[PDB]
Symmetry: C5
Subunit: 311 residues, 5 copies
């Protein structure tokens, strides 16, 4: 078998569609997600056209090996998809209606700059390579693009599953390549983050601030340094232990600031004690009293600046 | 190798049955479970009907490739099941009795709101796509549905394995599809949850409450902050090792409350010391004495409120 | 490609034998072990009998597809075994000497109640489903049941590899199933557990007991609470790395008791200080002096009770 | 299904080309990277020659099984690549133009001496073994070598993808082997390393230096030892998760120096207290005052020496 | 498709050779290593012997299915090797020269008693089972046993790759089996171990010894107990990540001794304080002064004893 001949000079249009059956194993570290879906393909092959009267059948069923089928591949996959041809139906005019069920581990970059208030667009790129006899172009039938109502990703809200109707046609290794962009829009379920991460982290930092209502250097050293240990310990507890980000994230900036605040609070505690020991209790007491307001105010202000910069 | 013809216009009924041989690898983090079972299939194909007299046999055995077999797939699976046809038996009236042994990693959502006192319903969805010449409908042969007595999941009690006899017939990709729901009901058996996680976690919290029978600020700071470190450390030790659930769990609420209590106990310790240092020992001593009763009472009360809200 | 016919009414006997080549990847957490072995099968098919004179050969070699072979499966496996047919030999009377090399991940429950002084019996269940024309029954020749001298599992002593000669014949889905039990007896190598886990864990607990020879509340609080942190930290280090079992283990009871002892020692330290501060140094000194004997004695006694209950 | 015959005695030239579609899963610990690319092959097999006039077609398409294809293997791969033949085109002269899409996990050594300011050259070695009838030699078709613009490796800048045009022809097991070197040059994106790892690690070290403005031995012991705990804790948190490299890395030297500085600061704190207790407050105060300058200066100097030695 | 007949009664000699292409993924915890190599096989079959004058070919090339090939298996493998037949050549005398490229995960026990100053001998056991008509014996072709110069294992020095030329012939399942031992000798690259693990672990222990130049019980308790926490914390950081070995290792003994030393130092600190408080400052001061020498001397001596016992 060889590609169907053109009636004029027109390229062959392969009408696609992807219907999500299952979405699972979204890996934030690897920036990969596992998908189980239907892939529908539709094209016209007049060599396969028939008279339903002199055939006795209104539809003809074929085996994949029996007829010409376009070679559709995915661009952003780990390995080639595991596919199972479900059905191949031919109508009297030569229209081929192909359907397969596939599973694939798709590689899609994730932007964590706004984590855990981030939204992601997961991509699935369909591609077809043209042959010398004729050019092959992809198209989307949006009626055939959908997802099962029970499709889920834990900790995410699945907004929509759509495709960018206009394909990306370009030349590669002296042949035309037609590419389609299938997009799965998801938004993170950030609720439990406040009581599970933020609030306890904030409490530890607030504990370190009680050193501003104490003159005991030994009790102050225990307060700021032991809370720093508790902060690090807490971060180990809730750390995914999975992603080291090249870029600066929102949460990443807050955490860096918290470390800076532990260092500044140590400097204060050190300064206050030194001034007290160096017969200057008026300056020590005035710094400690200022810190009581300065620390929560500078924190609340810098957080507003960060929230503004990232969102 | 075409579907059996209808006697009238009726759809083909494929009688199903699943018998669990082994259940294993239930992953709470991935919301998946590995199953090893028998899949029985029964349908009538009159093209296969024979006279036991002029044949000499009461039953006929066929190879899968020799006869028409419906394409049964699972909806909620990672990849297609690993199947091995055990037996194919045809009776004189054309009744086919198919049996295969399969293994599959099933994706089933889990509700952790009541953990570790939670119960789960694991789902296995059978499906069949109808063909050009006739519609295929699934049915349940209750005689063929069951589980091996030795079937186990560590830390779980297997209540029952049943199927919702009425199939879910709907339209998918312009063809009728009949779906079945097989349910495995399991309840968490975690006898050791109390001694292993709860009690050591409560002991650490109770140690922090000894600061209410002490006036030493240095000893009190060491008590509340060091126990907070011990609490966090203990939670790293008994860590679920599962990514935090988006929703608020029962255990999650108790743990959040424990962090809040560590913060409140710090506030008390800070207030008591400040009042003492600011020549008000009557109000400091009255707060510390109230806390001795207030802390266990508010804890025991809030826990009853939480237990009521979740159960 | 039909089962051999009976001479009278008797069922077909398939003589089995498993010879362990390699045993590896014993996962305590998954309760699974990977095995690489030989599977020998012996049966008589009179349709295969021949005259060695006419044939010119004393033995005949066949391909698996050329002759009838019983469908032997394993009950407690993740997926069907990866098998490679090594040899098929037919003697002039129609006796078949089948041999294959296989690898399989076997699921076998493990009892950790006596850990690390536990012994386990690993099971491999062979099974055959009886066919339409005649019943198939399994048998063992214990001469053919063996293991390579170099077979090993790190941290275990392999006592024996045997089979329960009497098969378990039962009805399942209206047919007979003949099941065989192959047992691998292993006993844990518990020596490094004393210097690596037990002894350092006891030293940490003993350090907390030095608070009974001190009147300094600040030093005592640091002793009991810092050792509790060290205990938890040590447990994180020597993590069994297995999720807590549902049942109460021997080691599990000892560890729970150690947490209880840290709580009791805190109560003592708190009581001592309170009586000392509340003008009662006679009681505080008598309690502390009693604790010096009470704590090691109650510990040593409760440990004897636990060791008695578990063993 | 035999190699093409030589016209004289010349070796067969197989023109190669690799075009990267996707690059992912670069494992620093395993020294491996997963690649998804096109592999183009071109050679002359005159036995496949045809007249485009008699055939009608200007190019002929073949199935891989229909014609002879050179056995190209990769030297540094875990297992043989997962390949999918995209196209096989034969021109009238008998020139074959082969194209396949493959995925492979490539093993390439990584030098971490300059981490996180390191650059790496990832290698892909193509190889062909010569046959009985004729020698096979590899060549590079530069028109067919490249990478997709969207190719990315999280935390890396992809500089270039090139091939060393001159093959390495050598004898192995009495036959000629022609080897090609495909190189992917990458450089690490080290920015978030400063605020995420370096800066919080420096703050903990600086906190330990506040002991040089304190005479309280109890407060000093708490400062240096508690910060050492915080340092270790922080290292557990931002752990590379890679086993210690056999060689001494840049970051490895800095961390070793930080441990040495914690030990030296302890020695100082111990010396200062001993001199004070042994009626020598002039010597104690002069050491502590010197340390205030000595510690940051020696640190800043040794860091310059290390940066010079490694870069 | 029957073994070659013997000229007399001699067994068939299969000359073997393994050439390492790649060595990777050496897992200490799993005691496995992944290998990628060539397997050469040579044997004489006179049924394939031909006259070169009337045939006119250097060597005849065959497909695996076309001729008899001995079934060579590996003893110590997880699953059967992934093999790709590279070449099959037959010379006029009937000498078959077989070559395949394979990948396999080999199970080889590792002795960690001398870690990290250990050397290992990795084993690859070739095996052949004799057949009905004749016995098969393995031999080593030393010209075909080697390794690629670029073969590497991170953290190891690859000394040599050799084979024990004399096979181990024994009876198994009533047939003769000829076994060959291929050995890969490797020695660990222990340099970064001193600055990364040993030296910071000794510094933490040395810090605990500063308690011998202090009379402050509160400062001493903080010294010994906080360093014990730092030691455990450090061990978590540079954790082997391998499950505890059943046997006592060199490093294991040193670490056990370090825990014993922390306990002894606590006893001293406790004894010194008790003697001081129980009006015996002469006895207390003499113990603390002795400990200053006793602790480093006993440590240095016991370490020499351990180093002597293990090496
Ligand atoms: Cl694909
Ligand atoms: Cl399926
Ligand atoms: Cl099986
Ligand atoms: Cl390859
Ligand atoms: Cl093998
Ligand atoms: Na086709
Ligand atoms: Na069929
Ligand atoms: Na057969
Ligand atoms: Na070929
Ligand atoms: Na053969
Ligand atoms: Xe998607
Ligand atoms: Xe955060
Ligand atoms: Xe601040
Ligand atoms: Xe189920
Ligand atoms: Xe909890
Ligand atoms: Xe907190
Ligand atoms: Xe409270
Ligand atoms: Xe077993
Ligand atoms: Xe210890
Ligand atoms: Xe224990
Ligand atoms: Xe506790
Ligand atoms: Xe006790
Ligand atoms: Xe590369
Ligand atoms: Xe910090
Ligand atoms: Xe660093
Ligand atoms: Xe210094
Ligand atoms: Xe090896
Ligand atoms: Xe240190
Ligand atoms: Xe700590
Ligand atoms: Xe060590
Ligand atoms: Xe000692």
């Amino acid at each position: 078998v060889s590609p169907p001949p053109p009636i004029a000079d027109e390229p062959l249009t392969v009408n696609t569609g992807i219907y999500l059956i299952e979405s699972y194993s979204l890996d934030d570290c690897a920036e990969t997600f596992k998908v189980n879906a239907f892939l529908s393909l539709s094209w016209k092959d007049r060599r396969l056209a028939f008279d339903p009267v002199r055939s006795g059948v209104r539809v003809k069923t074929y085996e994949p090996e029996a007829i010409w089928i376009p070679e559709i591949r995915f661009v952003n996959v780990e390995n080639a998809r595991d596919a199972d041809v479900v059905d191949i139906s031919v109508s009297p005019d030569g229209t081929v209606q192909y359907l397969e069920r596939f599973s694939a581990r798709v590689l899609s970059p994730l932007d964590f700059r706004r984590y855990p208030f981030d939204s992601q667009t997961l991509h699935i790129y369909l591609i077809v390579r043209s042959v010398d006899t004729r050019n092959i172009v992809l198209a989307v039938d949006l009626e055939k693009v959908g997802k099962n109502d029970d499709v889920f990703l834990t900790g995410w809200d699945i907004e929509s599953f759509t495709a960018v109707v206009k394909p990306a046609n370009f030349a590669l290794e002296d042949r035309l390549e037609s590419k389609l962009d299938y997009q799965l829009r998801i938004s993170r379920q950030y609720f439990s983050y406040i009581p599970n991460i933020i609030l306890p982290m904030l409490f530890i930092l607030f504990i370190s601030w009680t050193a501003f209502w104490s003159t005991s250097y030994e009790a102050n050293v225990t307060l700021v340094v032991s809370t720093l240990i508790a902060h690090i310990a807490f971060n180990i507890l809730v750390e995914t232990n999975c992603p080291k980000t090249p870029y600066m994230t929102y949460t990443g900036a807050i955490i860096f600031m918290i470390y800076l605040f532990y260092f500044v609070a140590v400097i204060e505690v050190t300064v206050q004690h030194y001034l007290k020991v160096e017969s200057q209790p008026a300056r020590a007491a005035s710094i400690t009293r200022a810190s009581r307001i300065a620390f929560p105010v500078v924190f609340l202000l810098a957080n507003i600046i960060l929230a503004f910069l990232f969102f």
